[PDB]
Amino acid sequence: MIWKRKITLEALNAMGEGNMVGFLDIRFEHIGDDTLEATMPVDSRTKQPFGLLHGGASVVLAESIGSVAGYLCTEGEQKVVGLEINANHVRSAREGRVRGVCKPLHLGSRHQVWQIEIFDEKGRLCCSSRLTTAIL
């Protein structure tokens, strides 16, 4: 178990209300001992002009999940902030919801590296991303 904070999915989902996370219907759905998972619809708010998932929406999902996960691995007054992000778009998505799964690559005292894989509804990899955070 990597977490230092014990926060439920309901509290996480409550925080998204009234901001970008809520606007895109990103929903946190599972917390493992070393994973965090959220889904996002492929719809008008997340689509390119001709119906495929906007690659930027996948990054919004990746950065949201990676930041939350990083924060959960700090304690007390500590905050995390994303410094760098990269993403590889390997497959497109068109319908249903995509699902982001975030795992740690490195949990440091000063920075973290997170990997987020985004899968379509059939479980195929669509986007693979790395987020580097600073702990402040």
Added chain:
Amino acid sequence: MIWKRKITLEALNAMGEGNMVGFLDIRFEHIGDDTLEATMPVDSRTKQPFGLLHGGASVVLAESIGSVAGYLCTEGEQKVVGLEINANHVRSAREGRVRGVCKPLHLGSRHQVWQIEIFDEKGRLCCSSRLTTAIL
């Protein structure tokens, strides 16, 4: 000029309606002989829960401008898709609109690389990104 397609700012903004670009009020505002620019509000649709611009929103902006620029540099039946995107978030934004400025780093026959820098309303760098596209 680097462009091979002639597609006006009016037409671009029209095409964003009903999809992610339109829902975030991203607006294409300038096309130079070798640059392309668009702006985006910092508001509830693009903010983190505690009020700052969501880092994923900047990447939506970057990927949108880069992908369009890349398309405008091809011809005929050619398509352009983003392959890899990366970004450093160097400064936060909290109000007004941010502006993305996109310039080519490489215009090839099979792939392209675009640099997109996003600035707050005062002209200060907030996000520096690179997009690699594939020409299909």
